[PDB]
Amino acid sequence: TRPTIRPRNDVVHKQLSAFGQYVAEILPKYVQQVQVSCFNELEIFIHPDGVIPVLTFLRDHTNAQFKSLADLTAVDVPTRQNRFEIVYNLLSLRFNSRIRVKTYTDELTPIESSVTVYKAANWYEREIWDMFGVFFANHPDLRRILTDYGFEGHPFRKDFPLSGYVELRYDDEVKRVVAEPVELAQEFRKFDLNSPWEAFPAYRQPPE
C-alpha cells in the first residue's frame, strides 16, 4: 500500500468525528445520524423540520462559522418512500472545513426555503424545483430556471426518460416552431454493463 494507494489522514478524521458528536449533542431534536467517510468528509442526517434551525446554527455558532453555501442539490432514489434526498454542502473559512447536511422529502411535502439563511440558496432551490419537483415553502420567487417555458415534467427524476416526450421543429404551414411527440431515427442503445461478479466485499449486504 504505497504509491498506488491514496494516503489516509487520521488527524482530520478524528477532528471531524469529534465535531460531528458536538453538533449531534447540541441539536438532538433534529439530528438523526452522523457519519465520517474514509476520505474525511462529515455528513449530518437530519429530520426535515430542522433544515432552518440546523443551517442557521452551522452559520452563526462561534465554533462552526460555516458562512459559505457551496452547493445545494437533490438526489432521486425511487425505492424510498421519501423519494428525494436534499443535500447542502457548506464551507467554513474560519476553520478551513467542509460539512454536508442531508434531509429527505417526497413528492407532496414542502421543504422550508433557506434563503433567509443563505441567499445563494435561491437559484439552487429553483433548480431543484425545476429538476425534481420539490416545492420550497416561503421561497421569494419560485419558478423554472433551466427548462423551456411551458415544459412539463421534472427531467432529473429517474423515471423521466432521457430524450423526454416532445421534440421541436420549424413548421412552415403555421410559420413557427412547434412541439411534437419525439421520434428518433436511431434509438439510444441501452447497454447492460454490470458484471455478474461482486466487486467490493466490504459493501456486501445481508442476503435477507
Binding site: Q186, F188, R189, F191
Partner: protein, 176 residues
Amino acid sequence: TYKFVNMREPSMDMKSVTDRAAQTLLWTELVRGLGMTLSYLFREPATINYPFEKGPLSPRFRGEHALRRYPSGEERCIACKLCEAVCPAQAITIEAEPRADGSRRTTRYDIDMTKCIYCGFCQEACPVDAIVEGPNFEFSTETHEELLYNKEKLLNNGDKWEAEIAANIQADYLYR
C-alpha cells in the same frame, strides 16, 4: 502568502501634485496608449496566408476518421465492437457476420460524424489499430447526409490517407 493590488498612496509634495496636474491637463497616459498602438502598427503581423499556408499540427492531431488495412490489403478490423462500446456519443454502429472464408469481419461500420465529438476514444480502444482519427480536417459538406459515413466511405478514407496515417502512427506509437 498574499499581496495588495490597490493599496498605494500618492505623495503630496508640490512636485508630485504638479506632475499629476500636468497629467490631468495634458493627457500623458492617453498619449502613452497611443504610443503603444503606434508601436504595434510597425510590427510584423501574425497572419498566415491561408490556404497557401497552414497552421502547425501534431502527429497526435485528431481529424477525419479512417479504417486501416494490413500490408497485404486485408482489413485490420475484426468486429470486436470495443470502439462502439466506448464511444461517448454512440456515434458508431457495427454489424458483423462470418465472411465467406470464415473470417470475423464487419458488414456495417457507420460513424455519424454529426454525433461524433472527435475524442479519439475509439482509436485508443481499438486493439488492432483499425479505426483511427486521421490528419484531415477540411471535409465540410453542403448537406447533412454526406456526414453519415458508412464502411465504404471509411475504407476509402483509409486508402486515401494511409501514407500520412502510417507516418503519424510511427511518430506517436512509442507514447501509447
